[PDB]
Each structure stands twice: as structure tokens, then as C-alpha cells.
Amino acid sequence: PWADIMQGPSESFVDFANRLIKAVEGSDLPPSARAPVIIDCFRQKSQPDIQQLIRTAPSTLTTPGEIIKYVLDRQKTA
Amino acid sequence: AWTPLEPKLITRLADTVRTKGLRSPITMAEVEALMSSPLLPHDVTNLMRVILGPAPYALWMDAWGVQLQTVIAAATRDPRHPANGQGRGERTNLNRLKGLADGMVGNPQGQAALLRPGELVAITASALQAFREVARLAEPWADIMQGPSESFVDFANRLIKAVEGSDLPPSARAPVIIDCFRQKSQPDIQQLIRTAPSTLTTPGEIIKYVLDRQKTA
Amino acid sequence: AWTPLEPKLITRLADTVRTKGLRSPITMAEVEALMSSPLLPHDVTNLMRVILGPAPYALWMDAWGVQLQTVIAAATRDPRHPANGQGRGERTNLNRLKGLADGMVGNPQGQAALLRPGELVAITASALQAFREVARLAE
Amino acid sequence: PWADIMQGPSESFVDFANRLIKAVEGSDLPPSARAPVIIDCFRQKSQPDIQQLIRTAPSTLTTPGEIIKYVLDRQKTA
Amino acid sequence: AWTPLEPKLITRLADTVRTKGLRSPITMAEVEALMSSPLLPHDVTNLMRVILGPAPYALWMDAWGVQLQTVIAAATRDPRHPANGQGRGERTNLNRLKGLADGMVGNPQGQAALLRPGELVAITASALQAFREVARLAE
Amino acid sequence: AWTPLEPKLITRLADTVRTKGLRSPITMAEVEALMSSPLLPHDVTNLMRVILGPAPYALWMDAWGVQLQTVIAAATRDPRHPANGQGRGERTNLNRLKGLADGMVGNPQGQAALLRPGELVAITASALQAFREVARLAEPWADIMQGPSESFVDFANRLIKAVEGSDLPPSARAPVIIDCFRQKSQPDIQQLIRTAPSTLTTPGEIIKYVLDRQKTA
Amino acid sequence: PWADIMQGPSESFVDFANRLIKAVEGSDLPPSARAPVIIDCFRQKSQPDIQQLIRTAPSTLTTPGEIIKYVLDRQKTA
Amino acid sequence: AWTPLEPKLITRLADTVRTKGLRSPITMAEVEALMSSPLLPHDVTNLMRVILGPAPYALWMDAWGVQLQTVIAAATRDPRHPANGQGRGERTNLNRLKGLADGMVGNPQGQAALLRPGELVAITASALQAFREVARLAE
Amino acid sequence: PWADIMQGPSESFVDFANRLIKAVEGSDLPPSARAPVIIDCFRQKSQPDIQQLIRTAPSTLTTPGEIIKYVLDRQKTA
Amino acid sequence: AWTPLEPKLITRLADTVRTKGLRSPITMAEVEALMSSPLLPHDVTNLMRVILGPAPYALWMDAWGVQLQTVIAAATRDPRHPANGQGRGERTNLNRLKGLADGMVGNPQGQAALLRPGELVAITASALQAFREVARLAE
């Protein structure tokens, strides 16, 4: 179930994005509703450090690929 | 023929002034509403007597006199005033503007008879400006900070209120509001505005940008 | 001839916006109610000045300008706009929509004189959409 | 009674002026004696901060409205 | 007539990408090998769906769209594109490049029918450049 | 005939820019001094090459181009520009302003030959404005308070410096300086300004009044 | 000696002014130098409460009588 | 023809004002030295802009205006002012003294063209007296 | 050597730009290869705060002067 | 011819002011008594010097100057002042009222020579009003 996917405390972001995109594209949603759902799940899941990282984006991110690129650039190396 | 204003509207306006105050935008809108048709000096005088307290009424009489004197100076500086006439016999004295001239003292019917429509609109605009002055006088922007727990829209509302209701010229409010958004508005929003890939040149644009990219918490 | 909106209705609408907020369906219904007859730029501008706070009013001015610009782009994309005319001399500039054109600045009577009914309804729809945007943005 | 009106330690000046003008105009004085009485009551009542503010007026104030305007301009914001 | 790529070659390429990674010169050589004949949007899309993981596939869709948009800008900047024609009725829209146009959605046979060879080679070069970008970005 | 600027003056100006910086009033005065006679594009270009570092020189080239483009827009908006002529054959292109036109590239003598005096003064004013922009860019007023032990002239100097060297429009500096004198400038001077029997409508008048009636300590 | 006159900690201001004007007028100064000396002695003597009271005078006091009147008006009743 | 003052002398005078202050007799002597030839309003204005800080410069502008107003009152009190002429068409307005008149704003060459030597010496004496006042006031 | 120039942790950006432009223009590169090299060195050197500041530029910067102006405008005052 | 006031009456008045004060009705009656005949500026000045202390004397000089200035304003507002004359050559300056004019400084005989009776009564009334002001102010 896509709506139950959370980014674990120790999980990296690319694994979380892979799992989420997999569960969203392999589901019962229409094809035209996958990108907005993936974006809004990146924003509300993806534990509050990345949540604030996406929130304070000086540019407007309108695609899952752009969000992934931005987060991978500005992520807290740890 | 003179028709008085409804005491119901006047009572509602008086209670509006009593609860909201003199300076609220709703109060100024209501005054503009009851200032729609050109009023005779009797009407405006009684209106301000009823809606204003004693001390604001004294202040308003002073300010109205000063504004009418400026109007009469402009009138003697231009013989084409809609209150004036072409010959010298139609020059309008302050006794005719304040309703003190002959055949007008205490009588609204005679007032409405002898007065010109240009006279009426000039008196009305003068009274409105005097009301604005007294309202600004009866009740500091550079001391406004965004509190640690305060949201940004409340801070923006408070700051824009204090800047527009102050002694600055009209052409100096937007730059001051912008530069106060940048230097107040605690360092998280300060850095959010600083790192703006676009150049924000308006308080509305800054507010929109900050509301978009703000840290949801 | 221009007739102003009742300050009683405006006061009631302002208190509605004050208690219920900008986004409640009752508030949007009340705005639609007071947005029934085509309003002149003066009317809508003063209405938003009274019912909205300072910061929402700035946001609303921005959004209204953007929506009016989209309308003017559609107007230059179609010479059959109810605001436009057939010849090029009736093309509607943003100074005429925002009430900034000659013979209109600060004067609602002259405004009502020179404006078209299509102009009025376009301005009104633009203002309503801008109000919706700002309400969705404020909260 | 107008001659018993004092500006309270915590009262603002516009409230004091309203109360005083009310009590003076709604009294048994002749109409031609209200303005001088209101002025001289502004000067002797209206606790010593405003008393000194009115005393050190570089201009001569000859009307209750002018005194009110001057005091509202130069009052100690607090 | 459309002929699919061998699932054996695709499986070998997928395991190559799995062990060597996206950026190794051997992997890019293998991709160039399987990118030899001009592929239809269906072929490249399924190929990237199989060889790439979910997140690299999203990145690749983004990059492919951007590169195709640059191609279409160059095409509207030159009416002599091998994908374009001489008249205005042969101008190539992004729905025709991404395989979204009418008569192409989900059908590779119709795709191969309506597409031009210049269209195919442009799509292929765009996909290769997008793969290079995503490979440089992922690691 | 073209005469070069003295390398002694240029060396002194370069050392002035090196020690005082780009924004000091003495530096701007020195630049105005060496910007007295109308200079050819060659002169101003070499001058900025010598006195400015590499990055400020790049910024200055950008700003000079932008200002010259604004000048050329005003020139195509008015055929009576002192750089233009009456016919269309005297219209001035940016290649002629930047010294890139034919017969001018690298040759100051030919430059001085073909250029107009209006062209020279326009180029010079453009270069001065560009220098001002870059100086303001290379290196907060609403955070300035008068310290408990600081004198008033130091506070006024600091405040006027920070307000005039900021992003405010020129017509908004005096009201901001006044309203910052009134709200900053710790409550003794605040009350001293508040209880002013006269109305002070200029920073100089406020400074004079406060210096007269200040508490000697 | 006029230049040795100080206002005592407990002395009133009218006594100090009387003593100072007496010692200045009954001295060897020219007649045209008594008023400036009396003023500048009011400003520098007359212990720091009255010193600050004279310093913060919104009007310019240019006569010993005017200074005396101002100080008597705004003095700290004690 | 207008010749500017040396920036070397101005820099030395500025450092003198910076170390010795505004009121030292050496500073007043140096100012009298640089106040020897009759200066145009442009020269004195820029000189005070450079040597004085912001707040002393504001004070000096005020004092200079007041002294020039006293000069203009004396000028309207005597038609034989070396700045005035015999007829009424040569009466000198404060816009001509402060350099604000037509053909003078920002242009020192035109300034030097239209100004009289009596005008120059009156402006110079006024500026010197204003400097003395501000120096006595600052410390 | 231009390719060894890094912006120090405590160094300002104008000093780094001066040093880099000096070393690039005083080197063996052709004249037509200096601007692209200076730009690409601004992007890859100039420690990751300014790197991300240049990366997230809503406009396309195609000149060292424009990059310098943008960075000087939006730099983190510290 | 000038005749001085008796030092016996002046001593009695000084002791009255010393015991009863400045504001007692008996003191004001005594002052009115010694203010019966029109006095020359010399007489009133010496009288106030003797009966008043130093600080009340300074206050009285101030108040007397202010009242005389009001009198001179009324005099320039009416050419029919008993101190004035019909032509402009008889206009009365404050130097003539305060006894500072030419031929009067320190000499009471010349004072009595050049002064008018209207001048004397105006000076006397001014001095009486100033005494009243100072008496109301001192206590």
C-alpha cells in the first residue's frame, strides 16, 4: 500500500524513493494521478529533515525527478 | 430641498465608530459611504457632533477650518473654482463655506438654497480630509520584530498596518516594508528571503515567496 | 450611474471574513453574493481593501494583476472578446481594466461611463479567481 | 462638577479631555466662559508631566483644540 | 513491421547494469550497442523500465523529456529537421515524439507505422543523452 | 587631439581605492575629480582596468553596458539627443559608444576624431553611474540603535551612512532617517525630540535641535 | 569671589541665584560681562539636577531672569 | 573655465579634520587656505561632502541655507549688492546661490558661466560662517 | 596553477574570484577559453554553499561578471 | 524739572514689601500710591531696584520689557497713541521707553526733558502690570 510508506529513521532517500515509486506505479491509481501523489508523498513522508529541506526550496519543484535531484544535492551527508 | 440623513444610519455609524474606532478601514469606508452625496455644512457639522466625542469634535472643527482655509487660498489663486464665479461678486468667503454667512446661520433650507454644488463638494472633501487627519491624530514601525512563535502572515499584517498608518510619505512605504521584511523576520525567514533566486521587488511578491517556501511547523 | 455597495453588507461580510476565515464555504458564498452585479474596479478595490487585512490585500492585488494579464493575453489572442471591439481602436489595455486609464483614476462615475459590460464581467471574474487563489494561499 | 476633575495617574489624555469638556459644556456656565475655563483646567489639572508639556509651549495656545493637538503630538508614548 | 529486442540481450544488459553500474565504460558501450538501430518510443521506454531501477527511471523520464523539448525547440527553429516536413502540417509535436499522439498510445505497430526515420533517430539520440545525464547524476 | 591622464594621478587614485575602498566619500570625490573632463571610451576603460580589481572590473563592464543601453533606448526615444543628430544617419550605435565602431577599435586618436562631445559626456555619466552601482554592490539601517554610552553625532553619522548606502530610493531616505531618529536614539533623546515646540522636518534640523538642548554629560 | 559659588546640596535655587547675582554684580567685572557670566554660572554650578533641567530646555534661555523663571516653573518640588 | 580643487589637498584636509577635529585653529586655518579663491556652489558642496561626516554635513547644509537667507535679506534690503544688479532683472534668488537655478543643477561649467564674482564671494563667506557655526556646535 | 585553486573555508568570495581570474588570465590558455573555464571553476570550486547558490539560479548565468553579481547579491551575510 | 521720590517713603515701602510680601493687597495699594504721579524710567527702575530683591528684580525687568513691547506693538498698530505723534518722526522706539535713547542714558533731567506725558503714563502702567505679574509669579 503506497499510503502506508514512510522513510525509516536509518533509511537513505534513494531507497525510500525507489520503494515509493514502485508502490505507486504498481497500484490501482490512474496514470495521470501518479506524479502528484508521488510528489505529495515525498513532501509529507520522508522524515522531517527532508520535509523541511523540500519545504524551503527557493525554486518550485513540479516533478519527482526534480525533487529527487534537489534532495540528493542538498542532503545532509551522514 | 434639504433632506436629512437617516438617524438609523447615523446611529449605526456612531456605534461603528464606538466599537471599531476612528482609524479602522471599515470605519473610513462607512464614512465614505455616508459622505457620498454632497452634504450641507449643517449636515456634516451635526454628523460629526453625533459620531465624534467632544475632544475629537474640537480637533475636527480645527482641522476642518484649516482645510477650508487652504481651499479658499486655492480659490483666490484661481478664479475658475467650481465654488467661485467669473466676476468678483461670486467670490466665496469662509462665512459661506462654514455656513456662517447671512441667511444660513442655523437654517439648513436657506443653506441649501444659496449654496453651489461646487461649494458643497469642496466642503465635503475638506471635511473628509479633516476627519482623516483627526483619526490619524487621536490614536512605531521601526520597533516591530517577528516573535519567536509568531507566524509570518501575522507579522506582515502588523508591520504593514504600522507602516501605512504612520507619518511616512506614500512613496516611501513599499521600500520600507521590504527592507523591514529583510532585516526583521527572524533569521530563518531572513535567510529564506536572502537566498531568493529571483529578485523580489514588492511586499506582495515577498509574502507569496515566503508563504510558498516556508518551513511547515 | 454608479451606486455604491451598502456599508452594512460590507460590514457584515467583513465580520464574516473575520470570524469564519477566508476559505470557509460560507465566506465564499457570501463573496459570490456580493459579487453578483458586475462591479467597477473602484468597487472591487475598495471591497478588498475593507474586508481583507494588509498582507492578504497585497497578495490579492498581485493575484488580480496576474489574472487580468492572462485575460488580456486571451484578448489579444481573440479579437472577439466582449471587452474588445472589432477595430483596433477598441483594444482594452490593462490601464483600462485596473481603472488606471485616463478619465478613470479615482473617479467611479467616469469609470462607469467609459467601461464596457464585458469589461466589468471580466474584471469581476478575475477578482473572484484572485480571491480564491489568495484564500487557498493564506491558510 | 467640572472643578473636581483630575487626570488620573493611568488615564490617557483624550479621555481626560473628553470628560472635562463634557462636564464643562453640560454645566451652568455662560457660553462665553467655557473655552477659557477648559484651557485653564487643561493647564492646572492634567498631571504635572502634561502640565510642564503645556507650560513649555514655544507657541501660545489659545484654544482647547490647539492644546489637544499639541499635547497629542508631543506626548510621552507609554 | 516492429520487431522487439531479444529478452536475452535485455537480461544480459540488465545484469551488466546491476554489477558494473550505470557509469562504467563497458555499460555505456553495451547501451550504445543496444542503441544501434533506431528504436521506437515503446522500445526505449520498456528498455529503460527493465534495466533501470525505479528512481533512476524517474530521473531518466525527466531528462528524456527535457532533451526532447530542446530537440523540438531546435525543430521549430529550423523547418528542415529530418523529423519535420516542408509544410506546416508535418510539424512534429512532443506527443508524437514521446509516443503519446493519436494512434500510438500503447500500440508499437501503429507507432512504427506513423513515425519517421528522422523522428526515430532523434528520439534515440535524445534517450542516449538522457541516459548519460542520469548516469552522471546517480553516482 | 587626445591627451592621456597622468599615471601619477592614476597611481594615487588606485592607492586611494586600495586603502579607503570603493564606497568611501573621499574615493567618490576623487573619481568625480578624475571624471571632470569628458573622457573617451579608451580612457575610462583603461582607468577602470587600472584602479579596479578583476572581479569589480567585470561587474563594472556589465553595469556600464546596461547603463549605455538605457542611454541608447532614451536616444531612440528622442531624436534630439546631444549624441544624436537630426537625420537618421547620425543615430548613435552602441558600437560607437563602447568604442567598438569602425575606425575606433584600439585607436584613441581616431576615437577622439569621430566622437561627439555629447557622446563623450553621455559615456562619462554612464560610467560614473556604473561605478556607483558596482561600489554599492561590492561591499542594516533598521537594526541601528544608539548605544547607552554613545554620543548622538556618532549615532547620527552611523545611521545616515547606513541609510544612504542602502537599497532605498533617494526620495525615501530623509523620512526614514527622521523616523529612525525618533524611535531609536534612547528614550532621553526620544523625549527631547518629542517635546519639540517647533516641528522638525529635516535630519539637519533635528540634529541641530538635539545638539543645542542635549544633556551635557 | 563669584567663581567659587556653588549651590549647596540642601540650598534652594532662589537663594543660590540671589547669592550669585550679588557676588557677580558687586565685583570687578565690566557691566557688559555680568549677564553672560551669570548665565554660564547658572549652567555649570547649580547641582546636576538643575544643570540637566537647564540643559534640556526646549527653548533657548538668553537672560538670567528667563532661566530663573524656567527653573522655578519646572523645579522638583521637595 | 572651472578647475577642480586637487584631491590631494582635499585628502590632506580630510585627514586633518579627522585627527585634529573641526574646531582646532589649525583646521580653521587649513579651511581658510582652501577657501582662498571664490568657489562655486558645486566646489563647496563637494568639499563639505568629503571632509565632513554625514551628520555634520546635514548640520552644515542647514547652517549654510540660513546664512544664505540672511544674505538674500540683506540683498533685498540694498540694491547695491555685489551679487545684485541695478535693475530688478539681476536680483539674485536662492536657487542661483545654492546652485539650484536653471542651467546650473549638477553642471559646474554652466555654474561658473552664469555666476557673478560677488555671488561667488558671498557664497564663500556664507559657507565659511556656516562651517564655523557647525564646528562650534558639534563639540 | 588555476586548476588547484579552491575557496578557503574562511575566505570571502571576491578574494577567491580575484585570485581565480588572475591565475586563469595569467596562464597558458587561449583567450577564447578563459571565460568558460572561469565559470566552470566558479561552479565546482567555491565551497558547497556558493555551489548550491549558483546551482539554484532561476536565471542562466553565462558570464563571470553575472555570476559574481548574483552571488554578491544573494550571499549569506556572515 | 525732575524731583526724586522721598527715600523715607521708599524705605517704608521696602520694609512693607519685606514684611507683608509682594502679593498682599496692602502692598499693592502702597505701590499704587507711590505709582500715582507719572514716573520717569529712571524713577521706576531705581524704585524696583531698591524694593525688590535681585531675582524678583530680574523677573521684573523681563516682564517690564515684554509689556513695553506689547505697548509698542499697539503703538505701531495705531498712530494716535498719546506717546506717538501724527508724523512718522514722533514714533516712539523702545530705547525711548526704557530710557536707553540718546540724551537719556543715566541722566534723569534730560529724560524728563525729552519724554512725553503719554510716554510717562504708558511706562508707568506697563511697570505696574509687570509688578503684578512678578508678584503673582514669585509666590
From Swiss-Prot, chains A, D, G, I:
The record marks 28, 40 as: Involved in capsid protein dimerization upon acidification. It is found in: Virion. Homodimer. Homomultimer. Homohexamer. Self-associates to form the irregular polyhedron core composed of hexamers and pentamers, that encapsulates the genomic RNA-nucleocapsid complex. Assembles as a tube in vitro. Binds to inositol hexakisphosphate (IP6), which allows the assembly of the polyhedral capsid. This is Capsid protein p27, alternate cleaved 1. The gene is gag. The chain holds residues 391 to 468 of 701 of the full protein.
